[PDB]
Design a protein around this nucleic acid. Structure first.
Ligand SMILES: [Mg+2]
Length: 59
RNA sequence: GCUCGCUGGGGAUACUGCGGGCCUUGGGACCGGGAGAGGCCGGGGGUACCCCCGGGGUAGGGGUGAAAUCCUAUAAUCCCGGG
């Protein structure tokens, strides 16, 4: 019955804000699309633009 | 010699006292560029902790040398968004 509830979830793709390039940053599961609002994701500046100097900046 | 105590006169001016004059070293006043968790009043913040509401998840959490009381199917511990 529990695994039945897990099958109801779909995956959504998360994009960076517009002025950072709007690139893909990850995926998240949810059954109702309204529940995805106000979720927060943390990424490093190196992932956005590749350079091993700014790996300690978190957005 | 003792009753070391009193009293009439004369002399001296180093020290203490008293009166006058003149100083700046002790102390105080003022000006300059700086130092400091010294005090009082107003404003703005930092993490942390406790309670409440909403979403996920399901059987333990907590605590001791070892345990038990205690919290938890009215959904806890743990994770996320708010007050
Ligand atoms: Mg809940």
């Amino acid at each position: 019955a529990a695994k039945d509830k897990w099958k109801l979830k779909q995956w959504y793709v998360i994009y960076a804000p517009d002025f950072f390039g709007g690139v893909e940053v990850g995926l998240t599961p949810a059954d109702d699309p309204e529940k995805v609002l106000n979720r927060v994701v943390e990424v490093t500046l190196k992932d956005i633009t590749g350079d091993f100097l700014k790996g300690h900046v978190k957005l």
